[PDB]
Design a protein. Structure first.
Ligand code: 0YQ
Ligand code: 0YQ
Ligand code: CA
Ligand code: CA
Ligand code: CL
Ligand code: CL
Ligand code: ZN
Ligand code: ZN
Ligand code: ZN
Ligand code: ZN
Lengths: 524, 524
């Protein structure tokens, strides 16, 4: 048999440095995990031991920490080049800074092929970008070749800023003819590498004839065979085996997110490129694996510009930004309003004639707001100030919730009101009125929401059967602070931009801010 | 006697072109008035006839039309230079584009002295600006000299954008020692030329010893001796005679605004510089005086860049901007909200630790909103589109109103509701609730206003005895659409920036707008 070792990462999300166990800032260095220096150590060890290795990224290196804010993708090109990645698929967050912010820092500087078979361009953009990403690449591996075929979420226009000169085609439609074409070119070992989520990954494995292995991302899917090595709970075995429409067994892999694990799959192929066997497991990059000293020293060099940036003025406030718990856990607070207005602003995407914007609504638990910002420092706001408000290294995510689920969340918001608990909700695009003299679970007496499918935004009563888009912290999407109804009842969940970066972008755009408390939340 | 002819303008406010009778756009050319070409004709005729002439401007050439938007003061330097003005005093609107927007276009390019004795600078600004404006200038006139001493409203920090490195001193305090100094220098004929308003002009005439004549502005004061030649109603005789604390009769003049009239005062002096007699009258610059063809042709040349600018994209909207009368005369409309939010934004000035901003409140009659803007032209908004919404050539002014006066205005807003009448009020920083089943004059059931003297802006009930600052159209400050209570009861009124320019600046700053209808006005 001819044996190939596939090493793979996905949704690294700017975790260039080692992190805590939960992927937020490293505090206790001796129990920290991930980061590119440690990844370098483990990839170099595997390349010493195994003759045929590919190192692949399934997209979403962009967006997640101050690294991306400051270096805008140049850190991705530089450090992925240092690790000698073999190929990368485009993820949705690679379009966060528009097509221009992808061509220049990443497409022009990467030393490896960047792939997506289902993205087409038209007009002058088509000539500008031609060949800078590719539908696939054939790579020599020892005395063999392997075809790698890319794909990117069709939902990217709702999740990022690709512009209106790119079209995201159905993945399976776009992929099949490229895989058929590779077969005519005597390429019998084919990896589909892409960024659409585990459910779509399984469909590609099932339906795209001639794919031998699917290496995915986007859904942050953790798969494991055996007892798991950390806190992540497996969604299935690694690899997850799909029985294809042509009768083959096709392994599907993913490796969680944030650079915490290195995916590792060993495939044995026969001479005609059929998969004889597949086995492996993601490797937890914990503190037992040393950081490579050379990469670590380059990281510490690049950190200087970050530390400088962190104390620069982003913008000014002329009002006190009240993120005190005595306000934000008991009533509408103007820090909560600022943060939700920034969330909505970050999620302005290109629209149909059927909506002014696809999302208008925001919720934010008051327990997530961790500091005020005083306006008396000449009004200045810095990244460092925002990091005190939003210290958990979260994201502001897009979900779909039925009205009944949202009413349940608002009842939960006040179920034990008066104890300074974290679940009290700050809001945007929602006007709620509570009557606290009513029994827990029956205290919401009015709940109106801003329309999306309307040319003039205005408020209407919340409808129990209608499904609403809502921007909220990943902590809430995951059921934190007791919002189990959100985790259990949501219809869709996509991970969004870094919390601090959403607020910092909005402050920088506005220049001078003055958020008021204006009646979004009232008590009767 | 030695006879001096003083020609004077004030508060021209960017009326470089001839205007209608009411100072808005010229429609019927053969009955149009003012403009610099016609002014040139009349000044040149007077200079042929009278040997000793000074042509003076008492400030506020800046701000008022698209001329100022595009040329930013370069049009003022150029055309005031072409008319060979002798001196100008700084007005409040000369600081609309900051100190930098006054030094460069105006101070560096004017060929005549620009004066203010009561403005001091500190820090590096003091060295940058030293001698670019002067407390006074001594001018030769025939074989004599005349001293001209400038002054500028002490309220300029609340009316414009002078920055925090300029200090506006009390006028009389600053003026007296400069006038005493001119007397030691054998200058016995002294004109105080300045921009503080007719009431302060009379105080200077009364109290500043040795001033022979006061030439003022800011209050748009029309003075006339005899039957008046147009629609303006005189506030007093021209000149208005003040009996000074040292026993002299001191003439005080002003000449309305907008370039409609040329002030003309003839003074006879004895050999020691005492005023023997004063008489004259503003001259209405009507169509019987021809436009100078050379100046007119230069005006038409400079107009090209205006016409080009008028169709340029200022910014984008992703929502329909509903300025229809069926919305804005019956309920909260999102064009009204946009326009009021722009008004408040235009009136952000440097604040004390005693307020977040000195003004938070806005009213706008729905009859003043004259078009919607469709968002389906790729979202683009142009100046030309804004001119359709706001076609009257007005300003957004600052007034002080007791709460009782404002409650009366809100009752007037709905006194005959249902007829599509113009007085229905759009708002900012105010939340009103009407009950239309109540009798006219008793339909306002809740009226809450955004605080100013607070670090976190929030809403409280309106207090009948408290005096509120409010930004509103000059049409309303003047009692239009039946708001006689505003005209009759207001405590303070200062004229503000051009209506279209306030909105265009705000759109350009925001880049992408999406105003909602959000509950500022409700019916119960
Ligand atoms: O926040 C508290 O009530 C607990 N405290 C109070 C304090 O710090 O003064 C101490 C503490 O240990 N807090 C750190 C962990 N966070 C929380 O306990 C609360 O903070 C919020 N939280 C925590 C983690 C997170 O990722 N997101 C988030 O919103 C939740 O509302 C949660 O209830
Ligand atoms: O506006 C109307 O109801 C009268 N119309 C209706 C229409 O044009 O379809 C005709 C008209 O002659 N209008 C021009 C003059 N303006 C007005 O009559 C109304 O427009 C508003 N107006 C007028 C002049 C002004 O300077 N500011 C201002 O707000 C007032 O609400 C006033 O009631
Ligand atoms: Ca094969
Ligand atoms: Ca004298
Ligand atoms: Cl999925
Ligand atoms: Cl006055
Ligand atoms: Zn991701
Ligand atoms: Zn993704
Ligand atoms: Zn003026
Ligand atoms: Zn003025």
């Amino acid at each position: 048999p001819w044996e190939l070792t596939i090493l793979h990462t996905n949704d690294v999300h700017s975790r260039l440095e080692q992190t805590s166990e939960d992927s937020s800032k490293c505090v206790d260095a001796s129990r920290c995990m991930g980061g590119v220096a440690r990844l370098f150590t483990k990839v170099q060890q595997i390349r010493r031991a195994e003759p045929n290795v590919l190192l692949l990224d399934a997209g979403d290196q962009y967006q997640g920490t101050i690294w991306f804010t400051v270096y805008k993708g140049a850190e991705v090109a530089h450090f992925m080049n240092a690790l000698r990645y073999d190929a990368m698929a485009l993820g949705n967050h690679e379009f966060d800074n528009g097509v221009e912010g992808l061509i220049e820092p990443l497409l022009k500087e990467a030393k490896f092929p960047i792939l997506s078979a289902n993205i087409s361009a038209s007009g002058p953009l088509a000539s500008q970008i031609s060949g800078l990403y590719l539908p696939y690449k054939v790579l020599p591996v020892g005395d063999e070749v392997v075809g790698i075929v890319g794909y990117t979420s069709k939902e990217t226009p709702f999740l990022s800023n690709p512009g209106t000169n790119l079209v995201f085609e159905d993945e399976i439609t776009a992929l099949q003819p490229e895989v058929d074409k590779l077969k005519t070119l005597n390429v019998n070992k084919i990896i589909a590498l892409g960024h659409s989520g585990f459910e779509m990954d399984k469909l590609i494995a099932q339906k795209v004839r001639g794919v031998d292995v699917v290496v995915g991302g986007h859904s942050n899917t953790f798969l494991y065979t055996g007892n798991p090595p950390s806190k992540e709970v497996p969604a299935g075995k690694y690899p997850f085996i799909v029985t294809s429409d042509d009768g083959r067994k096709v392994p599907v892999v993913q490796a969680y997110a944030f650079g915490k694990y290195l995916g590792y799959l060993k495939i044995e192929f026969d001479e005609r490129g059929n998969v004889i066997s597949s086995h492996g497991n993601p490797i937890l990059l914990d503190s037992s694996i040393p950081e490579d000293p050379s990469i670590k020293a380059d990281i510490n060099k690049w950190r200087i510009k970050l530390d400088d940036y962190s104390t620069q003025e982003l913008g000014k406030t002329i009002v006190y930004l009240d993120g005190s718990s005595q306000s934000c856990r008991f009533r509408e607070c103007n820090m909560g309003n600022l943060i939700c207005d920034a969330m909505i602003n970050n999620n302005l995407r290109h629209a149909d004639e059927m909506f002014w914007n696809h999302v208008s609504m925001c919720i934010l638990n008051g327990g997530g707001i961790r500091s005020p910002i005083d306006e008396r420092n000449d009004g200045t706001i810095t990244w460092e100030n925002l990091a005190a408000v939003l210290p958990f290294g979260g994201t502001f995510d897009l979900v779909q919730l039925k009205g009944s689920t949202l009413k349940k969340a608002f009842e939960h918001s006040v179920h034990r009101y008066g104890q300074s608990t974290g679940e009290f909700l700050q809001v945007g695009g929602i006007h709620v009125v509570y009557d606290l003299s009513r029994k827990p679970g029956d205290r919401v007496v009015k709940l109106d929401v801003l329309c999306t499918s309307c040319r003039v935004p205005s408020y209407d009563p919340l409808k129990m059967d209608e499904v609403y888009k809502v921007i909220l912290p990943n902590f809430l999407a995951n059921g934190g602070d007791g919002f189990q109804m959100i985790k259990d009842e949501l219809l869709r969940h996509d991970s969004g931009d870094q919390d601090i970066n959403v607020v910092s972008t909005y402050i920088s755009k506005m220049k001078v801010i003055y958020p008021a408390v204006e009646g979004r939340i009232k008590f009767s």
